[PDB]
Structures are given as structure tokens and as C-alpha cells.
Symmetry: none
Subunit: 787 residues, 2 copies
């Protein structure tokens, strides 16, 4: 038979199975397939040829193709995986056909090895993901200018599928608007142009919005140099420019250097604004852990959405952040999401880098560029030094308040200068011991060592008075004040001091600002009682409750009377017998020293005159002006008025002017005081001048009394180190014809020591304790002399 040699020498594996599913034929092509030899399977069940794992399902196909023939179908050709005798599940092309061999229902199966074309199909399967995956849409056109294949970017960019765009003109697919009318002419010209070309089109999506597309056509010929294909690519220019301006705006915002979470939120907001129908949010990396960096308020869930992840990497190293964007299906094309993701990721890397650099910068900056002052870093060391040296530091926290008005009105450009002006006033005001710092924003710190209550009640006042007059901006005033808290304690660490200072600083502002306070309620009480005492002193001068007392002075060599001294004296049921060691500085703080001294001298004069008018006389009275410092320009005015109140008898009066030199700062006092001698008052001095030999010890000044203070005589009896200077002062008195008085003496031994040196007047608890205004007349009417 002719069919015998052709079947025998054939390159396709032909096999036949009887109606009972048993095989009866094989060939060398079948041997190239499977692997079994002919005799191994001739007359045996087909199941052995069937794959071992496929045998359970084969009977179903057998029944379907025998009982009903799969709806009376002889067979078909298709691909199937063949498990060769070596166990390899190779791929081959199978074909089936019902046959009537021997009058029975037999089935003939043809097989062909298909490894090579299977590899071609693998190439195509990779190439389809290579085409769907792409940065821009691309579609190839046959000689008749019909769309044949497209990509996922094309589909998601124009709302079209391959089924919808198959075999149809690009313009017919993207039906163009009639406005302008030349769009059709231009697109035809470009599409039918035989050479590579580019142009711009105004396509409108199947689902809506217009896109100003930039389309390009390129040719591809064949061996015969004939038109084989024309590849057309629709690069986006509308959304492409949207991403370009997205990067531009992200860089613009980042150039202002806003804080970390602000940068994250800005990036998220803009990313969503471009890739609408999505949410975005970033995570930062710290200590090898992710922390939610920023998010936009539009975090609502959207159906049919997919996540999309990227990693933030700085100049090198592990990630600095995690990028995640959830986008709803149909929101925007995948390549466009890629375009947004790359820019967002690189911009986020730069954002992380900026914060990282700012960390090391701020942590080590030793001066804040605004105001150029020291900052927290320097203040930390300048407080650690003091705390470890154990010298009690005092920390004031200043807060500028009522500032936001300038920021709102003129803007930051002028609000910065407004702060700098006050900071410069601080510098012009402060002193070498003090240290200044600007910790953050409108908050500053002052470090001091002098920590007396009366010192702080003045430093705080200076700091708060710095801003009395308004700040001049644009020649227009803009007021400000300060809330200043004072921390002062021993032992506690700088951290405790700063915490307390900030507590007080915020507390003052919350109460209303424009003020100052200590941290300690007890220390605040202290000043409350001080203020009450000051008001009481005001009322006291008003109501004439203070008095004066007299300390007798005697000629040390004879026992005759020499003078009396007017020691101020305060009496009060609310506070008992306060001493001049405490009630004078209160008068200085309250500014009533003027009335204090006025009443003192006035009552001294009135007592002197009312005793002169009676049958009693005394050598003189000495009022110590230096105690209240009596240093205003009315220094002679007050005494002149008081003396004129009852006539001028300066010869009967003495005055003490022990300002360290009384001319070291104000020469007007000296130039005007000569009226005292003109009236006859007895000038007196305690200290010894320094410069120019104390102005040649002012022989021109008619000094009368030289007073050796209490301490000198108190310490004299022990040491010749003081006996020598006592000798010198007494000798110079005796030589320059000056009367020397000693303001202290306790027991007979001190008086014995002072006797030999020829001291002229001695006063102290020895001769007579101070005796009030009511019975010193009795003492003088009784005792003369006292030795």
C-alpha cells in the first residue's frame, strides 16, 4: 500500500486507539516523543501513555468522546504538555480524529514536538509584559493604517482596550473635537506622512477630559525597503507637564526649608492633587524603625484600589523612608503613577537629607543666626560649668509678648527686625557677669551669679523695662512686653532650673503676660511682704510716725558734752522694731528716700529750735545723710528749706556727707554744698579719698568732723594692724586741726586704748546708749561729766 511507507517514514508521531481505549500503533516520531518503544505499549491501555497525574481525569474525556462524542465532534488540534518517559513534561501539538477502522469507533491521535515554537511563545509571553510595561503608550500600524496592538499605558491613558481599538484608524478611535477644524487635517497629514514626524493633537478620552497629546510616527521597512510598519507613540504632554510642575512646586516648597512633617504633608498633598482618586502618606526611618511621617486628610477608602510602594534612599545606605500610595483603578495610568513615584521618592530623599543635616547643624550651632546670640547649646555648657562648680546660678527666662501684631501686619521681613531690636537693647543693657542666650523663637535666657533678693528685684526690673518705649518700625511704633520667670535654687540640676523657669515663663503669659515672677511661692511672698512694707513706709511718712533718737558725745579728755547724733528709728505693731540695716534699702527701692530725708532733717531742726527756745542748750546735732544717700539735686535744697523754717544757725549743726568721695560721679553736689559752710554748718567726712590724693584731701572743703566708724574701733583693741591706722588718723586730725570722733566703744579697755592716742570725741554704749526725744533732757540735766 502507498499509505504504508508514508506512515512508516513520517516525522509526526501517529498513534491509534481502539474503541476500548487501547493503543495499536506507534512510530519513530512517537519514539522521539514520549520515549516508550512500540512493543512496550502496543495492545496496552492508553492510560500508560496518559500522564500519571492526568489519568484520573482522562476517563471523563473518554466518556464524553464515546457516549456522545463531545456533542458529535471528531476531534481538534491544540497544544498539550507531554510527560516523556524521562519524566519531562514537554510541550507538543496534539490532534484528534474519530475513525471507523474495522467498522469500529476508533480514535487516531497525531503528535508533533513543539519545543522550539513553545520557546517562541515564551518569548512572546515575556514580550507582552514588556509591551504592557512601558513608560509611554506605543501602537504599531500596518500598511492600511489600522491599530493592531497596544499597551496597558495606552489603555489607562485613553480609556480604550485592544478589542475597542482593533483594526481601526487612530482618529476614528480618538474622535477629535471639531474645534479647531484643522485637527483632522493635521492628524491625517501626520498619519499618512511617509517619514518620521511629530505633531500635537487635542484628543478627548473615551471617558472625558481633553489631553493635549504629543504624537510621533516612525517608519520601519523590511529587506525590500518597503513600508512594513509605522510605529505611533502618544506621549502625554498635559499630564507630563503636570508632573513637571509637580516637581517644580515640590522643589519650590522644599526650598523654604519647612519642618519635617510639614514637608511630608506638602508632598502628600501635591502627590494626591496630581494623582487624584488616591491617597498617599510617607513614613520616616528613625532608630531602624518606621514612624508615620505625614498624611493628607483625604484618607477615605476607595473601591477597586491597589497599593504602590517605593523606598527613600539618601546619598547612600539603608532606606530613610517608606513611600506608599493607594490608587483606585482607573484613576491614572500605571506609567504615570511611576512618573509621580520616582519624583516623590527622590524629593523625599532630599527632604530626609535636609532634616538630617539640620539635626547635626542645630545640635552643634554655638550662635543663632537670628540676633547672633548664644543658643541652647552654649547655655547648656554655661550652666553645667556653674552647677558643677556649685556656685548658685540664677536663670531668668524672658518671653517677648504681644508680638504677633507686627508679624501679621508688616510680615516676617519686619518681624525679624522687631525682635533683633529688643535683642540689641538687651546687649546694650547687660553686664559682664551676666550671660545671654536665645533658646527658641521669642524666648531668651539670662544666667547670673549675683543672687540676692534685692539684686534680682532690680535685674528683673531692668529686663522688663528694656521694652518700655515702643519699637520703631517704618517710623510707626509697635508695642511689646515681656513675661519673665526667675529660677533660683541650689543643688538642683540645670534641667530642674530650666523646667522651673519655663513653668514660670508660661504661667505669667497665661495669667496675661506683661510681667515677672519668681518660681517659688515663698520667694514671691517675700516680695509681697516687701511691697506691703513699702506701702506702710509711705503711710508712715504721710502720718509722721517715725522718730529720732540722740547718742550723747563727750569731750574724751574733760567729760564735757560735744554733740548728739540723729539715728533714724522705725516702730510698728505689724513688724516690730525694724533696723536701719533693712528699712533704708526698702525706701531706696520704693523711691521715698526723698521724703524720708526731708522729714528727718525737718524734725531735727524743729527739735533743735524748740529746745533753743527753752532753757536748754546743746553743742550740736549730726544727721547722717549718707545713710539714705540723699544724692538728688535737692540735697542742699531740702536742708536749706528745713533750716530756714526756723532760722539759720549752721554753727549749731553738723552734717555727714560720706559718699565714697561725693565727687566721683556728680560734681554738682560739691559745687553747690558750699552754702552749708556759708551758713555755718559743720561739714564732716568718714572715708578717705583715693584719686589725686583724694583731691589733695580737699583742704578747700571745710571738713570739720572725721568719724572713725564702728568696725575700726571694734577691731582695734586686738591688732596693732588697726592701732597703727588709728594712730595715723588721730595724728593727721591733730595736725590739720580737725576734730576726730569715734563711733563705737563698749568697755573700759577699749576706752583706755583710745585715750592715749588723744582721740577727741568718743561715742558708744559706754558713755550713753541712745536716749529718746523725751528723756535725754533729763539725762543732760543730771549728768555732767560722765567720768
Amino acid at each position: 500500500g502507498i499509505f504504508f511507507p508514508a506512515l512508516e517514514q513520517n516525522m509526526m508521531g501517529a498513534v491509534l486507539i481502539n474503541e476500548n481505549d487501547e493503543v495499536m500503533f506507534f512510530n519513530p516520531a512517537a519514539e522521539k516523543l514520549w520515549g516508550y518503544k512500540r512493543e512496550e505499549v502496543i495492545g496496552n491501555n492508553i492510560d500508560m501513555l496518559i500522564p500519571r497525574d492526568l489519568r484520573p481525569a482522562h476517563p471523563e474525556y473518554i466518556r464524553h468522546n464515546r457516549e456522545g462524542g463531545k456533542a458529535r465532534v471528531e476531534g481538534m488540534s491544540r497544544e498539550l504538555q507531554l510527560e516523556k518517559k524521562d519524566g519531562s513534561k514537554i510541550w507538543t501539538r496534539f490532534a484528534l480524529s474519530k475513525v471507523s477502522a474495522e467498522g469500529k469507533v476508533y480514535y487516531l491521535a497525531l503528535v508533533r514536538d513543539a519545543s522550539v515554537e513553545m520557546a517562541q511563545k515564551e518569548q512572546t509571553r515575556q514580550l507582552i509584559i514588556a509591551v504592557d510595561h512601558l513608560d509611554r503608550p506605543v501602537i504599531v500600524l500596518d500598511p492600511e493604517r489600522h491599530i493592531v496592538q497596544c499597551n496597558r499605558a495606552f489603555t489607562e491613558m485613553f480609556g480604550y482596550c485592544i478589542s475597542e481599538a482593533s483594526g481601526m484608524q487612530p482618529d476614528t478611535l480618538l474622535n477629535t473635537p471639531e474645534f479647531p477644524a484643522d485637527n483632522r487635517i493635521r492628524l491625517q497629514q501626520l498619519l499618512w506622512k511617509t517619514a518620521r514626524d511629530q505633531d500635537e493633537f487635542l484628543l478627548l478620552t473615551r471617558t472625558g477630559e481633553k489631553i493635549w497629546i504629543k504624537a510621533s510616527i516612525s517608519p520601519v521597512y523590511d529587506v525590500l525597503a518597503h513600508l512594513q510598519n509605522l510605529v505611533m507613540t502618544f506621549s502625554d504632554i498635559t499630564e507630563e507637564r503636570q508632573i513637571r510642575q509637580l516637581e517644580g512646586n515640590i522643589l519650590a516648597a522644599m526650598c523654604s526649608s519647612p519642618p519635617f512633617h510639614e514637608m511630608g504633608e506638602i508632598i502628600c498633598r501635591n502627590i494626591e492633587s496630581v494623582l487624584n482618586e488616591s491617597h498617599v502618606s510617607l513614613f520616616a526611618l528613625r532608630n531602624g524603625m518606621p514612624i508615620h511621617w505625614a498624611s493628607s486628610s483625604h484618607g477615605a477608602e476607595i473601591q477597586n484600589a491597589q497599593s504602590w510602594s517605593a523606598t527613600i534612599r539618601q546619598r547612600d545606605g539603608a532606606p530613610a523612608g517608606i513611600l506608599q500610595i493607594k490608587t483606585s483603578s482607573g484613576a491614572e495610568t500605571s506609567a504615570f503613577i511611576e512618573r509621580v513615584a520616582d519624583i516623590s521618592q527622590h524629593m523625599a530623599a532630599l527632604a530626609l537629607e535636609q532634616e538630617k543635616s539640620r539635626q547635626h547643624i542645630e545640635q552643634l550651632i554655638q550662635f543663632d543666626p537670628m540676633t547672633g546670640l548664644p543658643n541652647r547649646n552654649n547655655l547648656h555648657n554655661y550652666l553645667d560649668d556653674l552647677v558643677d562648680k556649685a556656685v548658685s546660678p540664677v536663670v531668668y527666662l524672658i518671653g517677648v509678648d504681644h508680638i504677633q501684631d507686627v508679624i501679621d501686619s508688616l510680615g516676617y521681613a519686619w518681624a525679624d527686625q522687631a525682635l533683633l531690636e529688643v535683642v540689641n537693647r538687651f546687649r546694650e543693657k547687660l553686664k559682664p557677669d551676666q550671660y545671654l542666650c536665645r533658646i527658641e523663637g521669642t524666648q531668651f535666657v539670662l544666667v547670673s551669679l549675683e543672687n540676692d533678693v534685692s539684686n534680682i528685684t532690680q535685674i528683673a526690673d531692668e529686663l522688663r523695662n528694656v521694652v518700655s518705649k515702643p519699637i520703631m518700625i517704618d517710623d510707626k511704633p509697635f508695642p511689646l512686653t515681656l513675661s519673665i520667670g526667675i529660677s533660683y535654687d541650689l543643688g538642683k540640676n540645670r534641667d530642674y532650673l530650666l523646667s522651673t523657669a519655663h513653668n514660670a515663663m508660661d504661667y505669667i503669659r497665661k495669667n496675661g503676660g506683661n510681667g515677672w515672677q519668681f518660681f517659688s511661692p515663698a520667694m514671691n511672698e517675700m516680695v509681697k511682704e516687701r511691697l506691703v512694707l513699702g506701702a506702710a513706709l509711705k503711710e508712715a511718712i504721710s502720718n509722721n510716725q517715725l522718730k529720732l533718737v540722740y547718742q550723747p558725745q563727750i569731750f574724751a579728755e574733760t567729760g564735757e558734752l560735744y554733740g548728739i547724733e540723729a539715728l533714724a528709728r522705725w516702730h510698728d505693731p505689724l513688724h516690730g522694731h525694724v533696723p536701719p540695716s533693712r528699712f533704708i534699702p526698702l525706701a531706696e527701692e520704693i523711691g521715698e528716700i526723698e521724703n524720708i530725708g526731708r522729714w528727718v532733717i525737718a524734725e531735727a531742726c524743729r527739735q533743735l529750735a524748740e529746745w533753743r527756745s527753752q532753757n536748754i542748750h546743746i553743742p550740736a546735732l549730726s544727721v547722717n545723710l549718707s545713710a539714705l544717700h540723699f544724692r538728688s539735686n535737692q540735697l542742699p535744697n531740702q536742708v536749706s528749706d528745713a533750716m530756714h523754717a526756723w532760722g539759720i544757725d549752721g554753727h549749731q549743726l553738723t552734717v555727714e556727707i560720706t559718699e565714697s568721695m561725693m565727687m566721683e560721679h556728680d560734681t554738682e553736689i560739691f559745687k553747690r554744698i558750699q552754702i552749708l559752710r556759708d551758713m555755718g554748718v559743720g561739714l564732716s567726712v568718714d572715708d578717705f579719698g583715693t584719686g589725686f590724693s583724694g583731691l589733695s584731701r580737699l583742704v578747700s572743703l571745710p571738713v570739720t568732723e572725721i568719724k572713725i566708724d564702728k568696725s575700726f574701733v571694734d577691731r582695734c583693741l586686738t591688732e596693732k594692724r588697726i592701732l597703727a591706722l588709728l594712730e595715723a588718723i588721730t595724728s593727721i586730725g591733730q595736725s590739720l586741726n580737725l576734730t576726730v570722733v569715734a563711733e563705737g566703744v563698749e568697755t573700759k579697755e577699749q576706752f583706755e586704748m583710745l585715750r592715749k592716742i588723744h582721740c577727741r570725741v568718743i561715742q558708744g554704749y559706754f558713755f550713753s546708749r541712745p536716749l529718746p526725744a523725751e528723756e535725754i533732757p533729763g539725762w543732760m540735766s543730771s549728768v555732767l561729766p560722765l567720768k
Copy 2:
């Protein structure tokens, strides 16, 4: 036999041709394929079934196969366009097999259609062309992470195509430098990521080049949700990487806020780095006109140079500048030039906006917000007020220089920190009366009010020393220098002074990297001449070429010469006859304060040795040492050494010091004076003691004699108080044999004016003008007394 039905009833197209090209077998499948009938086909030439246009060569192919053997190929297969009997042409897969009957040559043809396969092949060529048309590389990776496909972009940009790349790891396929930034591990891990990711990598071409690829890996899953393929896209981030570096650098710049011109220069540097041989220019817009803000310095001639412009607009879109890029003709790709235009323009946009704001506020700002120092306008108003008041200042143009080191190494932030550090030194050292501002950039200006050349040079030298110490920052201290220009002219405007000082600073900076001078060299020579004089004094004191004069003091009583006072002199031929009032301050300036005094005392002791041999019995010898300013660092040891040098006990030697100088350090000074007491060396204090008047009487025993200054003795007509000074001295004089010395007597009338006051010693020109070293014996022999 089944061999007949095996083919006769087959559905696959089958034909057979014998040696004579006659069709011997033609199956019903072949009938339904071609359209002929079996009877019409059998016995006819095979060419009838061949396409008419291809028939002529078919017999030639058959003859070639019959004769040449063709390596006895058993069979083959392919697709060709079959022509049917009706003339229609279709694509039909087919295969050829070689069979032999009766020992002759026969050929068997098998045929199927697979027209959908031809359509898929058309789709496959289309996929290849679609992916290959775009220049972005894409590759596909099997599950095991082996690259299994490539495209034209990848092969062109990496050398390896698929053939030499398939079936191996991408990390090995892609070679990297030796872990420059740990690139190997990053590539390995990213290649192993299971979720979509993207990073950057250095990859070296076949030749070997440092190119950067933005590897972007994405997975593709199957229908059953398993990892199926890994497709990645290496976008060549080289232009993109360059823009990344550009953005980072310019972001760092704009954050650090450099000056506007340096910002433009940085922009130009980056622009030329990304575009070699570029003549880029930033034509900003000022007052509606294009102003050259900056440009790249490489303006070399270019043939048909490519020119482009980018528009710089504010937030509202109004034009504000033009980035004009000029480059080699067509040397820049459109896709990359577009970005170096847009991104650079949009980053410079905020620079321009901030600069416009700063320019609007420039005429009004009063405080530079980087150093806190007053800006140019404050200084201008201050100098205007000073000149209106007729105050000529000295503009210490402190040109803080060498800052370029920190600028190039650590950048603008740490440059500002160093500037704040140096202004900290200036602020702490400047005296209250001085003023300091910042005229521009790094040029500070410290306005003072010192006209003395000595004070000016002292301020310059102390500024130089305070800047000399390394300026610590970031634990890498940098040395810094100053170029202090100075000027001083009465009645000249601020413009005159600031032009002069600026020109002087420029002149000195040009002549050297450090120094300081005046403008108008007419007076700059003063520093050089005084320095030469200082060197000459150094030489003279080292050589011991000075001289001494011995002025005697004559008793106001009837007596012999009380003593001598030794006064150091100097006589040189070149520098003139230098007086004491000149060289003593020069001695302090040059640092021989202790050395000159040591010479003075040594000469005094040697001359004491010389005198005693003759009848010169040395009543007493005072060697001053007050104007020479002995410090405690060298006083006791050196002053005492001269005592033993020639055997003269202190009973005649005398030193002098002012208590105003003793008060400099009260801790130890007079201890050495007591050592001198033990040695017998007397101490004659100055005009009078300072405060407390006691150290001049106890522990120390001065007032062995005390001297009255000539300025007072000759001015007694107004300084009449020196009479009381004399009597105060007389007190302790009669106490323990102490004495006064009125120095400066010039007439017998002054002698009468003094002697009435019981002064014991008279000195001055009148009784005896100073005598040369060797005439003391003559004066002694001649005058006893003169009266």
C-alpha cells in the same frame, strides 16, 4: 492493514511525490486544503499545487534536493502562503519528510493551517518593534532571578545582549566597582526584593564606564496569584542623576542662604558641570529691564552656537528673568535640555522672589539678620550724625578674610558659624565706646574714636591676636586672619572714609594674605618708623649702651646733699636724642619693661660701687622704678640681686612705687616691699596713698620720704592744698623721722614759697640741674650749701 486507514482517513493534509514529480498519494485532507480532486491530482506535476509565481523554481529546488543530497536531511517544517485551486492564497503550516519507495527518492508533505498562529507571529513582530522603538531598556527575569530577555536599549547601553546574558544572575552579569558605597549588597538585595521596588546603582559597561542606572523591578503574578515573572527597567540616570546632584547642591545653597551673586555663581557652576562648554547667563529682570545676574565664565567662541531661553516667573506667573543657555550646536539632547531648563529655572524662581523681597526691604532694614550687627544703613546714619557733630572716627574695616577655606570645605552654614564666632570675639573685646557693624558680606567695620597712632596700632594688634587663635568649629579648627584698613580725616564724609578704608583693605589684601594698614601711605610710614625705633631700642638695651644721670636733692634746711635720683637716659646718633617721656612708653610697647628696669638698677649699684671708693659717701640713691612699671613677675628677685653685686646695704638705696599701681594686685606686692625693708631698701611712695591710707603706714614702712610731683610743685598757685599735704607729711615726719621732697623748684621765689611750709628737701633745676655721670664729685666739692 491499519496502515491504509492510518493515512487515507487522516484529517491532516498529506501529499506524496515520486521521482517524476508526480503526485502518488493525495489525502482527503489535502483535497479540502487545496481544492483539487484526488483523481485530478494523481499523476500530475507537483507544480500545479505550487503558487503560480513560485512554480518555475520549484522543479529546480526538487532537482537540487535530489542531486546535492543536502547532508541527507530527514525532514523540516515551516510556514508558507499556500495557493488554492481558485487562486486564493492562505498561510498553512507544513512539514517535509524524505521517504523512499522501491529504492527511489520520494517526498512527503504534511500540512495544517495554524492561521491564528500566523496572526500571532504578526503580533510578535509587532511586539518586538513596539518595545524596540522606545529607547528605555526593559528586561524579564525568571522566578530564579535570571535575566532571560533584553532589548535594543539594554544592549546598546550595556554591551551584553540576550545571547551572552541569558540564564545568569543580574548581579554577576553587571559588574560594579569595589564597594565604593556598598553597591554590591544593595544590588543583591534589590534583585531579591519580592515587592515592587527601585534603587540606583553604579554599573560598568563592557569597556568600563561609571554610569548610573535607576533599577526598577516589578513582579507580575499569574491568574492563580503566584510570582510569575520579574520585569525591570534600567532608566539611565545620568542626565537625571546630574539633575539630582544639581537639585541637592542648590537646595543646600538656598537653605544656607548665601549672597545673591554667589547663589548665581553656584547655579552657573552646576549648569556648566551638567553642560560642559556652556555660556549660560541668568538675565534677571530689574525695573523692567534685563540685568546680568551672572553667567558661566566659559564664553569661548562656538560655531552656530545653540541658544535657548527659559522664563523665570514669580508665584503669580509674571516674568522675572530669563535663563539663556548657550551651548555647542546640537550637543544637547532635547529631553535633557528641557529639564536643565525647567528645573533650574523653577529653583532659581524662589531665589529671585526672595531677592526681590530683600531688595524691596534693603533700603529700610537696620539689622543684618545673620550676625545681629547693625547693617549698612545704621552705620550710615551713625556716621552722618558723627560728621554733623564734627566727630572724625577711625573706620577699622575689619575685613575678616581667609573665610574661603571654610566656604570651600564645610560650606555656607559653617561659614556663618565661623563669622558668628569671630564677631563673638569682637563683641566681647570691644570697649563700651566702640561701635561695630557689617557693611557687606564678610567685611565688618568697627567705628572707634581713637586718633593716637599708638592706640590705633594697639587696637589693630589686639584684634589680630584675638583672631590669631584657631577658630574652632566641628572639631576642626581653622586659622583666620584680618586685613584692618584704617583712616582718619577731619571733616570728610562717610563716603570719603568708607572709600579710603575699603581701598586700603584691598591694597593690603592684595599685597599679602594678612596684615593691617592705613590708607594714604603718606602716614602709613609711622608704623614702620616706630617699629624700627623699637628694634633699635631692643639692640641698645641688649648691648647695654644706655646712660644714667644723677640729680641731687638739696635740703630746705641747712645741710649737705640729701641724696641723688637716678634717671635713665638714651643718646643715639641715628634715631635722635630720645627723651624718657618718649622711650618709656616705647619700652612698654616693645616689651622691655622689666629689662630696662633691671639695667637701671644694675647701673645704679655699679655706680654705687664706683662712688664709695672716693670721698663720695652716697647720702642716698633713689632709683625710681615707678614710671618703669615693674610687675610682680620680676620685681623681688631681680631688684634684690643688685644688692650683693658690689656690697651696698639698703641703708642708702631707695625704690618708688605708687599705691595706685600697688592696688593692681593687693595679694602679694607689699610682701616684696617688706623684703626690701629687711634689706634696708627704702620706699618713697608717690604723691600720696590711696584709700584707707594705712598700707602707706603699716606692714609696709613707706614715707621714709614722700615726693610731690613737679606738676603740683610748679602749679602750687592753684594746687595750694600741697601745703596741707606738706603738714600731713610733717606729722609722721616728727613722729618717726620721715621726710617730704618737693620736686620741681625752679626759682628762689618758689624756694621762699615752699620753705615757709616746713619742707625739708628741695629739688629741681634751680639748685642743681642734672649733672653728667662724672660731675657729682665736682658739685659736692663746690656747693655746700648755696642758699
